[PDB]
Design a protein around this ligand. Sequence first.
Ligand SMILES: CC[C@](C)(CN)N1CCOCC1
Ligand SMILES: CC[C@](C)(CN)N1CCOCC1
Length: 330
Amino acid sequence: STGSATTTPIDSLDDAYITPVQIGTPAQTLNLDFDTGSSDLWVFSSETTASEVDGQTIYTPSKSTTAKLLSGATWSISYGDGSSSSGDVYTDTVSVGGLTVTGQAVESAKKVSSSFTEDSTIDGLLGLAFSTLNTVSPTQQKTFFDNAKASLDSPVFTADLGYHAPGTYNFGFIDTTAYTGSITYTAVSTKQGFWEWTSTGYAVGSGTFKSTSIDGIADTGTTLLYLPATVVSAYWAQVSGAKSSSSVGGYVFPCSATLPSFTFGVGSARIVIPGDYIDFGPISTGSSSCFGGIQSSAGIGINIFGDVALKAAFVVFNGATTPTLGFASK
Ligand SMILES: CC[C@](C)(CN)N1CCOCC1
Ligand SMILES: CC[C@](C)(CN)N1CCOCC1
């Protein structure tokens, strides 16, 4: 089997991407944030505290003839931005772009933090990291990918995120028309439950490539690119007027600037992030100070190749017995 679904930026800054997902019988279609940095499939639901729902589409298990309460199972997640959610668990039929999994754990939110409530466009998350990070207790549950894997033509999914445009998540096959050149594969460590890999270095604009190992995770659920302070300083040093602002919480730059590209290494290959991808617009409405798309990971404990980086590439998440990551230009 295979599946193919279009993923769409939620706003004009590509803050996140939503992908339609069919849950239950008859289908209830929710727009989920596919997140390769977490491993829970959780949704706004009929059980969510009413005051904590603000425009989201909800999953109503009682209207699904295939939904079954997973007795005694609860979940609770606290992401790395203070946001959180928790609730109970059903198993139900879940389909993505024509690919169907029966008995998928669907985590129904009883509570969500304000940061999720405010995102009216995101009806939940579909985690695509390793199932070892799944928060369901007392019996940990598998991701959609993990459940689908054996049935797939090939045990892979790919992320093809667009810049200010729709893109594609494919399951079970590589679309060889969706990228240029070849795919460079690189080793993955699953020890932290992430798609964790090591970049071979970077360049700023037309500058010389610096060979240096940078460990990090491929995370479709993070907006920006978080890298070591040395790397980030080197980048923003090339932008007149750029500075790290403690009050804003990162590097800012004059909105009138044209940004340099940023290149990262994948083995001997190179992925170029165009400068425009690194512009996340005014810090507040009407401001001429703009927020940078490359930020320091110093306060995080891990480097994160989020959407800023990933949308510059065609990315293969290879779930073979020994997982690997593939990157191609596009
Ligand atoms: C998780 C909440 C958060 C960070 C903030 N409301 N969203 C912002 C929009 O893009 C998805 C993530
Ligand atoms: C991801 C960047 C983010 C959170 C997008 N809403 N902002 C931060 C503040 O300056 C403008 C950009």
